RNA sequence: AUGAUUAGAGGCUCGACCUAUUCUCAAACUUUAAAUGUGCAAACAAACCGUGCCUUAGCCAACUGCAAGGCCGGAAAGAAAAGAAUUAGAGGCACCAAGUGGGCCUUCUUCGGUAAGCGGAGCAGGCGAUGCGGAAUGAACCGC
RNA sequence: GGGCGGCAUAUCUGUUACACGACAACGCAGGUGUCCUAAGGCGAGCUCAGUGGGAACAGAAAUCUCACGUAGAACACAAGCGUAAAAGCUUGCUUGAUUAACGAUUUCCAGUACGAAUCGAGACUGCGAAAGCAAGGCCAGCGAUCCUUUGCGAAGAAUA
RNA sequence: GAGUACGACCACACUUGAGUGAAAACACCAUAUCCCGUCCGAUUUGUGAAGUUAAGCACUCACAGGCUCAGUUAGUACUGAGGUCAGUGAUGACUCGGGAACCCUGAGUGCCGUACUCCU
RNA sequence: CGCGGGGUGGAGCAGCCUGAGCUCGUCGGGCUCAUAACCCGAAGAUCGUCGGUUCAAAUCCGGCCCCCGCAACCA
């Protein structure tokens, strides 16, 4: 036989990682630096623009750290976009931009500084330096916009990622998130320049429209082959030439009434589904019954 | 019932082709061209981890060229390799992890046009069998362990070879 | 032989407890330290920046200066026939809020509550009595205390 | 766990290998962990209370929030009760200088050495600098 | 005793050392006068030492693959400590190894220097999407007076 | 009674087998035109929703291994203070105080926040 | 005992400053009636021993088994 590595001494000396490290959720090395701030500020508020993307939804939150636990100041979800006219593609770049815009408008409304910081009403996909206490840009006396720092968790920070789509939406909503345009879609690293047209096209979903059109030609070419890509798109009859207008109207609707969410049914006790734990006395009794049964057989 | 779930269907995750020339230079270059032609993708070289006197290898010296093939090309290459093998494998060729492998002595038998320059080379075929849902052990976020019941065993691998390739297993112990 | 470097003879002093390794957590980072607060200087051997000298480990003092990453602590240190107030510069990961004044703060707060109750006419809590006073004892189990033969055999092994 | 170490047993005629044990250990090994210690606090330049006030080129997106220096008021068993301190406790601040900078002994701790009235340290007492009363006699022991 | 030897002569780690700190011997076990434009800085990705099963030559030992793997590896050296989505490995970009208004402080300590350190403030930067992180390689690796020698006080503007 | 995101403490939360899982989630999953990255769309990135609870994930179970808190070990080991105490010594006991550890054994197997959602 | 040097094919000796040579000797075949000389070829190491470092140790650093020296002074 072979030596057993995971023996009793191994378990006695084993030190477990943090719970969220074991579950693979929190990069605590990055979290420590994000929640860190100058000790001379004496715990003044600092906010993390938390961006998380599941397979079906986009979660955007304004989170302020406490010892007792983080506090979510405001949250926005891509699944609430149907309330604003987006029924499809709730995980694409356009939905990410809208979710960031939705979170920004809701946060500024709650703080009461909306209608003062309106951001960019029309998205051109270009970059502008955010106003922050760190960069006075001339020590002007204009009121600084609300500031949060982007948190992307364990997501790979590549060029054109949807996490920066949420970032672009938030900054266009009037929020001050420090960032450089190096990771926006359409940015060229060799020329060190940003192509605002390409960024704007992905913001308004032209790439989805072009892909949707091409698949429709393929579906028409081969009807006998069952088609899965864009299946709900075709079933809902979403023409490729209406996607850009739909997202434009969604941006206007978000700015018009950010507090709107999915309609809530007018609402009963909680039905239990948990399986009851056995008690120690029950477990000892069952073990004794097994031992006695083996004794009776022997 | 639970074993009849469509997500337990055993599939070929990848096919790994390895050529260990062990000398570096023109022979390794020609082996790289042969592997690139077969796999329709550029290969990746391997350097020697240590220096060994009897094998003529020094540490960090490039000695091997290998490639990983997935999808339809992997299945097509596997059928070619099994055809050279007459679809007959030994029982000990199968690992306890569900994967198996075999070796080809000459690359001409794979339906490859011989070239007087590149010469002939032998290769190692290794097939990694698996199921859907193994991503949970290789993803970045929330990486976890695949359930013990979801793993492919050696017995299931031989049953897969028999059922899907009409293979024959010679029950033997390696000498 | 023995040398006198900065970290000489700190093998056991500057070491993590068993199964308690790791860098400082978020709670230390979120701690607010103010000028005038009492802090305990405890070195965190996993940091190794801003780390106090071995003498100041386990000492309590008053913060006199706060910087973005550091804390200035005034520590009493006896030298010859006098006590010096040494101002050591450390990082915030090596200071913990001191509880040396916890009892006194509770005593002051209790006094204010008692004074407020007295000025508001609220009934005062009863005063605890001494356990050293005489009294009558009614036993429920009385046993003979004596040395038995079996006690001597019970202390002989083998 | 790291090192050291004795011997059976069970698994896979010997051996090896693995498993659970077993005999015995560590100034430069440790999960655990005292006693004796060591730092701080225990209300008079302080601290506590006030939708109190004034200032800041400080923090914060702002502020009535935070940081700081003050001003104006308030309350103060002046620190209860619970074993809930004690003091032959005038605190601080200087100035000018002498002799000394060979030590030795002892209770406990302790290193080198077979050991030594041997060499070398720790805490504290003592002799040196000091007799007196005791151990017959003895710088260091007992008492003082 | 002195000589011979050695160095306990400046200095670093563990132990002696008696659970704050401090402590002797020509006590014990070992180090230092170097080395690195990367072996410095930063971001990202990755996980190490070893095992087990399996694959032409191929065998103890070449490379490929999959599981286990609390660090049993690695971090220029001696040692201790520390570190696992790193402080290790790989790689992409870099020069924070520059300058730094006589700021303050620790270690030695007479609370003097010297050497190593710590916390800053200002300039100009690097890396990063961003919080941030860096003014060398954490802690050993070094030098007064006098003398010698080099750098800085560019150009032009001021009726003074 | 549950889920998701961010979390505080970081095993009462880990590890090994086994079973169960309403709703909504989460997740596997489908795919490669474009953004992006690889020998390999495995990872990663983008775009999707035909399928599945088979895995992850969550609960429950084990005279389970660990871990946590108690008892026991034991007033034992050791120790502050004392003797013109015992003993040739080694050392030991006594007097006024303090007081461990493993084995063993009993009980337990996460807990607490913010926001949104399901049950409704 | 203190300081220093040295263990290499059968013999003597290089290389001793990481990746085995010299002469003699031995073996085979020639030349001679034969031996020697002479000519043509061949074989022979694991660098005294045990550890450590290194991808790699005759080599570098430690202990051991031996060998050889220089010192062991003032009374
Ligand atoms: K002169
Ligand atoms: Mg990161
Ligand atoms: Mg110690
Ligand atoms: Mg300690
Ligand atoms: Mg105390
Ligand atoms: Mg009282
Ligand atoms: Mg007398
Ligand atoms: Mg002590
Ligand atoms: Mg000490
Ligand atoms: Mg990193
Ligand atoms: Mg100065
Ligand atoms: Mg240095
Ligand atoms: Mg150094
Ligand atoms: Mg340094
Ligand atoms: Mg369901
Ligand atoms: Mg995939
Ligand atoms: Mg499942
Ligand atoms: Mg199941
Ligand atoms: Mg158990
Ligand atoms: Na005497
Ligand atoms: Na700076
Ligand atoms: Na000089």
Curated annotation (Swiss-Prot), chain B:
PROSITE patterns: RIBOSOMAL_L5. The keyword Metal-binding does not apply. Pfam families: Ribosomal_L5, Ribosomal_L5_C. GO terms for biological process: translation. Its main location: nucleus. The keyword rRNA-binding applies. It is found in: Nucleus; Cytoplasm. GO terms for cellular component: cytosolic large ribosomal subunit; nucleus. Keywords: Cytoplasm, Nucleus, Ribonucleoprotein, Ribosomal protein, RNA-binding, rRNA-binding. GO terms for molecular function: RNA binding; rRNA binding; structural constituent of ribosome. It comes from the Eukaryota. InterPro entries: Ribosomal_uL5 (IPR002132), Ribosomal_uL5_C (IPR031309), Ribosomal_uL5_CS (IPR020929), Ribosomal_uL5_dom_sf (IPR022803), Ribosomal_uL5_N (IPR031310). Belongs to the universal ribosomal protein uL5 family. NCBIfam families: PRK04219.1. Component of the ribosome, a large ribonucleoprotein complex responsible for the synthesis of proteins in the cell. The small ribosomal subunit (SSU) binds messenger RNAs (mRNAs) and translates the encoded message by selecting cognate aminoacyl-transfer RNA (tRNA) molecules. The large subunit (LSU) contains the ribosomal catalytic site termed the peptidyl transferase center (PTC), which catalyzes the formation of peptide bonds, thereby polymerizing the amino acids delivered by tRNAs into a polypeptide chain. Component of the large ribosomal subunit. This is Large ribosomal subunit protein uL5. The gene is RPL11.
């Amino acid at each position: 036989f072979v030596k057993v590595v995971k023996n009793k001494a191994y378990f006695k000396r084993f030190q477990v990682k943090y719970r969220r490290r074991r579950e693979g959720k929190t990069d605590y090395h990055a979290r420590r630096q994000m929640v860190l701030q100058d000790k001379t500020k004496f715990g003044s508020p600092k906010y993390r623009l938390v961006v998380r993307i599941t397979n079906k939804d986009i979660i955007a939150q304004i989170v302020q750290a406490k010892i007792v636990g983080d506090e979510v100041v405001m949250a926005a979800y891509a699944h609430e976009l149907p309330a604003f006219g987006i029924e499809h593609g709730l995980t694409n770049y356009a939905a990410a931009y809208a979710t960031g815009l939705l979170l920004a408008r809701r946060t500024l409304a709650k703080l009461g500084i909306a209608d003062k910081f309106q951001g960019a009403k029309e998205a051109d996909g270009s970059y502008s330096a955010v106003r922050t206490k760190k960069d006075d840009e001339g020590d002007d006396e204009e009121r600084f916009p609300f500031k949060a720092i982007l948190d992307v968790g364990l997501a790979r920070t590549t060029t054109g990622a949807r996490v920066f789509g949420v970032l672009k939406g938030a900054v266009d909503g009037g929020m001050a998130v420090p960032h450089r345009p190096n990771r926006f879609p359409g940015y060229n690293k060799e020329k060190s320049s940003l192509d605002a047209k390409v960024h704007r096209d992905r913001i308004f979903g032209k790439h989805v429209a072009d892909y949707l059109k091409q698949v429709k030609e393929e579906a028409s070419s081969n009807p006998d082959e069952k088609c899965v890509q864009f299946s709900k798109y075709m079933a809902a009859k979403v023409l490729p030439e209406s996607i850009e207008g739909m997202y434009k109207k969604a941006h206007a609707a978000i700015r018009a009434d950010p507090s709107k969410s999915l309609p809530k049914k007018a609402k009963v006790a909680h039905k239990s589904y948990k399986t009851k734990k056995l008690s120690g006395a029950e477990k000892r009794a069952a073990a004794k019954a097994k031992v006695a049964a083996i004794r009776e057989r022997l | 019932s639970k074993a009849a779930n469509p997500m337990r269907e055993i599939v070929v995750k990848k096919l790994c082709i390895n050529i260990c020339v062990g000398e570096s230079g023109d022979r390794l270059t020609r082996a790289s061209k042969v592997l690139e032609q077969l796999c329709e993708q550029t290969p990746v070289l391997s350097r020697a981890r240590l220096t060994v006197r009897t094998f003529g290898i020094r540490r960090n010296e490039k000695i091997a060229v290998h490639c990983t093939v997935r999808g339809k090309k992997a299945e097509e290459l596997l059928e070619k390799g099994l055809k050279v093998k007459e679809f007959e494998l030994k029982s000990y060729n199968f690992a306890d992890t569900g994967s198996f492998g075999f070796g080809i002595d000459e690359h001409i038998d794979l339906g490859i046009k011989y070239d007087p320059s590149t010469g002939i080379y032998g290769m190692d075929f290794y097939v990694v069998l698996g199921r859907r849902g193994e991503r949970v052990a290789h993803r970045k976020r929330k990486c976890s362990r695949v359930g013990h019941s979801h793993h492919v065993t050696k017995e299931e691998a031989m049953k897969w070879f028999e059922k899907v390739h009409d293979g024959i297993i010679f029950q033997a112990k390696k000498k | 032989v023995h040398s006198y470097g900065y970290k000489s003879g700190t093998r056991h002093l500057f070491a993590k407890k068993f199964r308690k390794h790791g860098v400082p957590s978020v709670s230390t980072i979120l701690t607010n330290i103010k000028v005038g607060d009492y802090v305990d200087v405890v070195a965190d051997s996993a940091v190794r920046e801003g780390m106090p000298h071995k003498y100041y480990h386990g000492r309590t003092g008053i913060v006199w200066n706060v910087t973005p990453r550091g804390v200035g602590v005034i520590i009493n240190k006896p030298v010859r026939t006098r006590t010096l107030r040494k101002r050591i510069c450390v990082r915030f990961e090596h200071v913990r809020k001191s509880r040396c004044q916890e009892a006194f703060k509770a005593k002051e707060h209790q006094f204010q509550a008692y004074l407020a109750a007295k000025k508001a006419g609220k009934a005062l809590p009863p005063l605890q009595k001494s356990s050293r006073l005489g009294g009558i004892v009614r036993p429920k189990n009385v046993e003979v205390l004596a040395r038995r033969v079996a006690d001597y055999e019970a202390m002989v092994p083998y």
